Design a protein around this ligand. Structure first.
Ligand SMILES: NCC[C@@H](O)c1cccc(OCC2CCCCC2)c1
Ligand SMILES: NCC[C@@H](O)c1cccc(OCC2CCCCC2)c1
Ligand SMILES: CCCCCCCCCCCCCCCC(=O)O
Ligand SMILES: CCCCCCCCCCCCCCCC(=O)O
Ligand SMILES: [Fe+2]
Ligand SMILES: [Fe+2]
Lengths: 504, 505
């Protein structure tokens, strides 16, 4: 069960690195599948201080774009800092110029350290503000800054847009109060920038006139949009003034629990079903789908209302292992949960469980005040052991009935294993090596697969044990997480959050 | 996975039987352990109508006391109706005389003493019980009825549960509604003076009620060496109605309270004012409770929702055909085994945070600014309409203490159809099941030379009405892995039984 990290190697995840001038050849062990052709692109912090001025929070370091290229069984690695306003102005002024998530500078940040996604024929790196950064997926050059506020009424947008098979992009953002769903169309014949055709399609109400919830991701199915309103609130009174940073504006609402919300995607209409449950933080939706008259909502939850980001200051993450474990003792507990939301609410069933599906223990109780109280079916739960950074076979099973999810396992917040979960049987598979700290696993299907898990997962692994290559790209068979290959590099790679595989 | 019962054999669980004049010899297959010497005593309903007048609810049929005797590898079976007021008066008047849980009798208030639920020791005596103020002294050897005892003659309660805890010295603890609070009753071991320990009954501590005028239904409670745990659910008894109605008619569900959990210091006899709160569930059976550093570990068989589960347990529903049984259970609360963890040391400096600092659990307890402590469980077992119920452990040695194993009856849309074992630390399970076979609660008996917690057997009474077979049997499974050790078959039907005990001789 309990794996230990006394050597403290995970500190290398949070150590500054230098960008490269051109790609390095990675040394391959095992055999890279010959059908694997394209680029794994991932974003993370890469510079954790400017001179003698430190960044304090996990989400503050300057965005670094990484690329592993796969061709004919060979692999290269490359990385470049993203030339954001934050980064450029810091390099020019030799200090911290723009305030970051948890570091006040002594102007909204555009430090796009979180994810990269396609819009039309373009790729954008992002954080969670109004600024996204167009980047070149081949050379990793920075192209331009885009301000979503030039196009739509939001104050920010998540780093987790959903992307439909035709290239339509959906996202959600706070609007200072409601939450707006933005839709960006596929590239059209006119060839003009799809972002100039952005529109707000539906709006979700807020539980508190003046305190919107923090929102990190959302759910999408062919017919519905799902939004989970958590008790982690942004105190706008503090937000809109001023020595404050973003972290300083968050607070937890102790009494509201979680409110869940659905909208009809095609009719562009909020549905006034008052789904309610107990408090949790939520970062990542796993998948969402329709099953008879119900939505199945699979979530990576953190049990409690205290904001989990409070545990993610770099000083805490760089502590020695005994201290890391002790610091996490009172944190919210991670748990994968399936919630089931009834769409057809009959008053005649007031007082009863509406979840009549045969295959779940999730419940939904219709109350006399018309709230629908939910209880989850727990899919995975281990003590301070999170199944996080979830990924699925997204292109073919996103928004649809599915069986398999892949995740990064966090041990008291330290990433130390890769996991696969069968969401129907609760069976799990694990890949782990001592002193090895992987990243979010990304699934790539065999191009001719008919099965759900016929493919590989890719993860970037830091391995700072002194007799070893410092980092490598790991390739696992998706069926059972057995190792297929590694591509080793001779330089460190810091933590990365999210990314994508771009087939070529 | 989903096992089906199209033949409808479970209906035999709810079919009247005749008592026996003396014990029958049961036919043994396999090997009865030679160290197993004593009597399995169990209670259930055995007469489900009086003439043409039907009883309507699972908890209404007249109490039948069953006994399987084990000696030198041989087994006998015997049963006798308990001669309660309810039964005797019904036999005399040839009608339903006393109102039962879910059956109004038609012509002060005569409370039922139909002791169909359990049997337990007090001093050197054995009492059959239901959940009212009346318990019935019975002879564990002949199954004769000795006396009715009215607990109200001795202590201030309106009823007491069928699940008293019994300490190793014979001290009995129980809880009961007092019309409003909940009282813990303590009955001492038999003393030198030899007088009836019930005459020395006392109330040792009282739990407050969430609603001035509506006490919760209480079925069981938790006990450790130092604490008593009481779970106040949203299933309420509407006293306005209570004081053509039956008991079922007086229940209602409180939609907004959720579950309140309560602790008392057992040795100092005082209520602890920690406001533990969580989401709504029905609870019948505590599994086990224990102390772990500054926390209580509270393992429960829960039913997710506030609707009263007993609504699903009318005989007309339980006797339906299988497709209808499944359909009827679709909107019922879902069963789930949950571990709750209750912090005993509440520091204000931790307001807003999770107080459960133990290394081995995902249960949480959040201290709020209003001083409520909001709990979330660690789920130990969960299957769709598949309950791990009627839990039993190695009670004599692990009751109230750190433990690893529980045994249960598995309910499939309320139909008992399998026996289960759960490792509460690893969540591993083991299952025994045969087609068209409907078991009872499994009771654990330790091997005399046991080294480990699960060195022993479980005993269960199984109905097997498949037409090419003996109609019922006593099943013995090895507790290590639930593999079958023996059966003792009888040629007569045995209806459903709820609870019981093994009395070593
Ligand atoms: N992925 C973790 C958080 C990070 O993306 C981040 C870094 C910096 C600012 C920020 O702001 C989030 C707020 C943007 C405006 C609307 C409210 C949320 C969020
Ligand atoms: N085990 C299922 C319920 C059954 O024992 C039963 C049968 C008949 C009456 C009754 O009453 C419960 C109430 C008694 C008075 C105090 C409140 C509970 C309970
Ligand atoms: C690979 C990260 C390891 C260190 C931090 C792990 C703690 C993660 C807590 C839950 C997810 C937080 C959100 C990060 C992803 C994102 O920014 O989009
Ligand atoms: C062996 C019982 C089979 C038929 C009834 C099964 C439904 C049980 C529901 C949960 C337990 C309810 C309480 C019964 C125990 C008791 O009366 O002491
Ligand atoms: Fe994320
Ligand atoms: Fe019971």
């Amino acid at each position: 069960s309990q794996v230990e990290h006394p050597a403290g190697g995970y500190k290398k995840l949070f150590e500054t690195v230098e960008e490269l001038s051109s790609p390095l050849t990675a040394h391959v062990t095992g055999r890279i599948p010959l059908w694997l052709t394209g680029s794994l692109l991932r974003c993370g912090p890469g510079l954790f201080e400017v001179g003698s001025e430190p960044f304090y929070h996990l989400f503050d370091g300057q965005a670094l774009l990484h690329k592993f290229d796969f061709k004919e069984g060979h692999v290269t690695y490359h990385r470049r800092f993203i030339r954001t306003d934050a980064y450029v102005r810091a390099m020019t002024e030799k200090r911290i110029v723009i305030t970051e998530f948890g570091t006040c500078a002594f102007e909204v940040t555009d430090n796009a350290l979180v994810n990269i996604y396609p819009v039309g024929e373009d790729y954008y790196a992002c954080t969670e503000t109004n600024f996204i950064t167009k980047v070149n997926p081949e050379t990793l050059e920075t192209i331009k800054q885009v301000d979503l506020c030039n196009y739509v009424s939001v104050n920010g947008a998540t780093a987790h847009p959903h992307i439909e098979n035709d290239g339509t992009v959906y996202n959600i953002g706070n609007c200072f109060i409601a939450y707006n769903i933005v839709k960006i169309p596929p590239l059209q014949a006119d060839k003009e920038d799809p972002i100039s055709k952005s529109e707000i399609v539906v709006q979700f109400p807020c539980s508190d006139r003046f305190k919107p919830s923090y929102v990190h991701s959302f759910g999408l199915t062919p017919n519905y949009i799902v939004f989970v309103e958590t008790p982690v609130k942004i105190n706008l009174f503090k937000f809109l003034s001023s020595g404050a940073n973003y972290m300083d504006c968050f607070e937890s609402n102790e009494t509201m629990g979680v409110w869940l919300h659905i909208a009809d995607k095609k009719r562009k209409k909020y549905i006034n079903n008052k789904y309610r449950t107990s408090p949790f933080n939520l970062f990542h939706h796993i998948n969402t789908y329709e099953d008879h008259e119900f939505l199945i909502v699979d979530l990576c939850c953190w049990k409690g209302f205290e904001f989990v980001y409070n545990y993610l200051y770099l000083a805490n993450l760089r502590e020695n292992w005994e201290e890391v474990k002790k610091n996490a003792r009172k944190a919210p507990q991670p748990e994968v949960r399936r919630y089931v939301l009834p769409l057809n609410i009959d008053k005649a069933d007031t007082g009863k469980n509406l979840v009549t599906l045969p295959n779940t223990t999730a419940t939904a109780i219709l109350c006399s005040d018309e709230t629908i109280w939910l209880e989850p079916e727990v899919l995975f739960s281990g003590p301070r052991q999170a199944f996080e950074f979830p990924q699925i076979n997204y292109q073919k099973y996103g928004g649809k009935p599915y069986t398999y999810a892949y995740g990064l396992g966090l041990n008291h917040f330290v990433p130390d294993r890769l996991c696969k979960l069968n969401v129907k049987t609760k069976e799990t598979w694990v890949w782990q090596e001592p002193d090895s700290y992987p990243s979010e696993p990304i699934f790539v299907s065999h191009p001719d697969a008919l099965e759900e898990d016929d493919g590989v997962v890719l993860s970037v692994v830091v391995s700072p044990g002194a007799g070893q290559k410092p980092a490598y790209l790991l390739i696992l068979n998706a069926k059972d997480l057995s190792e297929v290959a590694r591509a080793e590099v001779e330089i460190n790679i810091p933590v990365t959050f999210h990314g994508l595989f771009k087939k070529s």
